[PDB]
Prior knowledge:
The structure is cut from a larger assembly and holds two copies of chain A, one copy of chain C and two copies of chain D.
Chain A: H1 3-30, H2 41-52, H3 65-97
Helix pairs in contact in A: 1-2, 1-3
Chain C: E1 4-5, E2 9-12, E3 17-24, E4 33-39, E5 46-51, E6 58-60, E7 68-71, E8 78-84, E9 92-99, E10 105-108, E11 112-116, E12 125-128, E13 140-150, E14 156-159, E15 168-170, E16 174-175, E17 180-189, E18 199-203, E19 211-214
Parallel strand pairs in C: 2-11
Antiparallel strand pairs in C: 1-3, 3-8, 4-5, 4-9, 5-6, 7-8, 9-10, 9-11, 12-13, 13-17, 14-18, 15-17, 16-17, 18-19
Chain D: E1 4-5, E2 10-11, E3 19-25, E4 33-38, E5 45-49, E6 53-54, E7 62-67, E8 70-75, E9 85-90, E10 97-98, E11 102-104
Parallel strand pairs in D: 2-11
Antiparallel strand pairs in D: 1-3, 3-8, 4-5, 4-9, 5-6, 7-8, 9-10, 9-11
Amino acid sequence: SALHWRAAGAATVLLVIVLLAGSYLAVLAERGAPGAQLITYPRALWWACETATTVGYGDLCPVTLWGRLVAVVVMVAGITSFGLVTAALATWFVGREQERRGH
Amino acid sequence: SALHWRAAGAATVLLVIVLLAGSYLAVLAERGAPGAQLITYPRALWWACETATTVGYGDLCPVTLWGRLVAVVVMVAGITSFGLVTAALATWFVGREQERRGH
Amino acid sequence: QVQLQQPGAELVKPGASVKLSCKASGYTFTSDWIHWVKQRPGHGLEWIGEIIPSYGRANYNEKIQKKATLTADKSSSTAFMQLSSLTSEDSAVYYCARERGDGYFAVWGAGTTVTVSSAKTTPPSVYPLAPGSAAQTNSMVTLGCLVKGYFPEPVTVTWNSGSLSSGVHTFPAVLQSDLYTLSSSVTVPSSSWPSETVTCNVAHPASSTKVDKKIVPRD
Amino acid sequence: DILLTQSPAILSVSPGERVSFSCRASQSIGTDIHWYQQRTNGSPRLLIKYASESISGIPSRFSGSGSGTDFTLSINSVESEDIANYYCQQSNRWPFTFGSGTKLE
Amino acid sequence: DILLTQSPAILSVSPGERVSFSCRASQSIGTDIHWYQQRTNGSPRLLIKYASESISGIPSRFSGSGSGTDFTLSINSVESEDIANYYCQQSNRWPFTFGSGTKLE
Ligand SMILES: CCCCCCCCCO
Ligand SMILES: CCCCCCCCCO
Ligand SMILES: [K+]
Ligand SMILES: [K+]
């Protein structure tokens, strides 16, 4: 269990937490604003998934400051997580390419 | 403070500058064009965030040449920044995998 | 079990205030929203506002005059609505409902009949209604009760404490000089009275005075 | 705010006949509509959630359909206990709104 | 260009009564509407920004609501100093446009 597989695994777990908490915080922030469609938990969870994966169909979109602020956190946490995995996959491939040589 | 952490840190700072300046340049370019919705700074800032993170819900979109030209800069600066971080995360993981061996 | 509990009625004079309660039971999640719905006599439902006890945040209807304050209490699982400076237009039945955060209202409350007037609270006078001496009876016999001289509404009239439901009518109350007045009727088989006890149960939550009255034949 | 129109206000029907209630939204709300029932001096009771999804406890007599702006609550062979007030409620955009109501006789 | 219609043009109301002004957009503009007040030979004064958000200095008598195409400016118990011209203005699409105006008496 090296670092790159530990961080990537921890990123996946953290991403799940952000998706769940993001759904809760989105509804809590979007309600009270007339015209907002992100006001129920199940679809807010679906919105979080297509937000963290960047994607963004447009069927659901935050219209409040805190609702959009939550979205930004979801985006970054999504991009970083899916990006931390790629960096982990590279370290795996690089470390094995040395084994196909003299290291 | 190595290079990869210096460039990634500088990319984050630069990304923030592009987001702010992009919001200012978008409104300045979109105003004067009938039907444009990207004509106020607060939502232009929100538009910049979902543009740099690629995501692009569709709630806000530039319709002018310079407005779309600014958007392209935001996209590239966004992709590069979030991409420069991943490359930095890889160098971190690779350099530590050598420490779990004989280097 | 009754999931949402509300007081029967609340009498308020214009200018004053009232704090309704909504004690909840059953599954209490962290995503639960408590809504409040106003319904004026003869009219339809009207969304007043919402509140999430978990966070304490409350939203309100903006199209109407905002005179409501929503607070919560996680310790006792009870939601509170504070109405301030009420007039005759604010006199209605206020329902509370629980939303799981999925849009619809799964369960509602009994509703609190809030009456706005300067009158005084008066207990109801209950009187029996037995058929006359020369009143012929067929295969069915009709009895009844008389509830008058009470304020404010409502009143709950049950026969034999719920066990009698079929053939029961409870006419709407009439208002004569700051005093409500209604009547209720029961229709049991002719060969069941007064052999089997038939009594009406009248409850007046506004004064919290529930009384019974057995229907005996005229002596 | 989304406006919900229920027409007609009073719906008269013979016993054992199929009766359909109407609810029209001022804008497309997908299937985010909900039907309720309220008898004389009673509390509203959920009949149909999300346009067509049925509720446990509610008789199979009730059914729902519709999408977008037009929705319909139908009762296959109506009986005496179905005499009440029927309201529709949307949950697509904040705030939640109710219909004007429809009286069944 | 977005058209804003204010009907009726003249709104007559008894003292101490709740009065509601109407503003209708030719297309959905979310909540990007703004209310102004202009008395006789005076400059316009901002009453409500973004449909419902209140302004410091403006009495609590004024309130706003609406979303999409229909918006409403309400005055709970109107008094004599509220006699003026009320205009609505959108900021959703360029260029900014004003309503025809509504006279309160
Ligand atoms: C980034 C998420 C911030 C948390 C927002 C909580 C919801 C605020 C309620 O108005
Ligand atoms: C890439 C951004 C170009 C800068 C555009 C400035 C706005 C032009 C005003 O018409
Ligand atoms: K997209
Ligand atoms: K899109």
